[PDB]
């Protein structure tokens, strides 16, 4: 559970991290450990260096994909619709 | 014959003397009733006043062979100084539903009156449009550059109205309807914008359309429509600017005034929620008395 909450976490921590300081991080003793979290849990080390914008990008968009959206954002005009109605309710 | 056009403001007298004209003639039945048309002229606002029907004959058959009394007209001008000595010849109205390629030879005839170039003002006597149920057009000579040679042909000119005191509130004196077609109360002004939105909305696709009938019903290049296309997109916005950007920024400005008066509302009924309860406070005692 340690290791999860951290890499949740370092999203908006960093941007990057050295292979041996991700390692430093989530606990582990052993490069190659860490390089196999990575695979599970979806980091991109790529010339072991992290990219959390990434990951960032990937998670924002799921939660704008789900109907709340209208009033998620709330729309210019959406604000002022509701005020016109209740003037004259 | 002064080329001094611009626009066209019509008395609400003209639109409505042009119909019952064209049913007591009883040239109907997709039968034309073609009259003389009387006002201001000479000035880039063509001002037209009032209208007088003509006997005219159509050959529904043929459109291209009328009756027109020629002499009846310059009879009819004595009277129309008597009316109001301002009104001299200035066209002729047409009946709808739209323009003809049968107009330019009646608007010939009509040269021999006016001092100005002969108006055609169409008044639909159906009522169909968006705005004014008129369009307005004027027979213009101009050369064509893309290679024939000189024609005459009919330029629109805008409709409008603009009216006298006397005839604006008869206008009102008249009528009774609160009227959604303009402004008023909030719930008045909500008609009217979400009929402008659908009004770009029908207008917009109407352009759609005429691009692709050129090229696929065989309707020629004419430039002069797609030269203002042209400078439509050229004003037309754009996004990811400092000016786009000062538009959010007066959002916040405006709303914070109506959330500060909304605010100022609530103050004042909250009082009389409390001045109410004054009301109450006496009417126990009473209560208790009887």
């Given at each position: 559970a340690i290791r999860d909450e951290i890499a949740k976490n370092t999203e908006l921590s960093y941007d990057f991290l050295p292979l041996s300081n991700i390692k430093a991080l989530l606990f582990f003793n052993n490069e190659k450990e860490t390089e196999k979290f990575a695979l599970e849990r979806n980091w991109p080390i790529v010339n072991s260096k992290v990219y959390f914008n990434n990951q960032s990008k990937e998670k924002a968009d799921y939660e704008d994909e789900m109907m709340h959206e209208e009033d998620q954002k709330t729309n210019i005009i959406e604000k002022a619709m509701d005020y016109a109605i209740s003037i004259e309710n | 014959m002064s080329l001094q056009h611009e626009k066209v403001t019509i008395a609400p007298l003209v639109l409505l003397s042009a119909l019952d004209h064209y049913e007591r003639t009883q040239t109907k039945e997709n039968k034309r009733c073609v009259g003389v048309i009387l006002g201001d002229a000479?000035?880039?606002?063509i001002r037209v006043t009032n209208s007088f029907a003509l006997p005219f004959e159509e050959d529904e058959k043929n459109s291209d062979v009328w009756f027109l009394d020629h002499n009846y007209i310059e009879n009819m001008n004595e009277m129309c100084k008597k009316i109001n000595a301002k009104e001299k010849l200035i066209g002729w109205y047409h009946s709808g539903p739209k323009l003809r390629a049968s107009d330019l030879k009646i608007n010939e005839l009509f040269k021999k009156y006016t001092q100005n170039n002969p108006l055609l003002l169409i008044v639909d006597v159906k009522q169909?449009?968006?705005?004014?149920?008129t369009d307005a057009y004027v027979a213009i000579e101009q050369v064509k550059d893309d290679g024939t040679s000189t024609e005459k042909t009919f330029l629109h000119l805008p409709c409008t109205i603009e009216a006298e005191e006397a005839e604006e509130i008869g206008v009102e004196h008249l009528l009774r309807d609160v009227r959604d077609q303009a402004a008023g109360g909030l719930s008045i002004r909500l008609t009217n914008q979400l009929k402008s939105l659908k009004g770009l909305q029908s207008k917009l696709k109407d352009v759609v359309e005429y691009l692709d009938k050129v090229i696929n019903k065989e309707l020629p290049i004419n430039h002069t429509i797609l030269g203002k296309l042209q400078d439509v997109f050229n004003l037309l916005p754009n996004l990811g600017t400092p000016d786009d950007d000062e538009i959010d920024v007066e959002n916040h400005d405006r709303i914070n005034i109506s959330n500060n008066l909304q605010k100022a509302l609530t103050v004042k009924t909250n009082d009389e929620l409390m001045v109410i309860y004054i009301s109450n406070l006496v009417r126990s005692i009473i209560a208790f008395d009887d």
């Open positions: - | 000479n000035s880039s606002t169909q449009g968006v705005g004014l149920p």
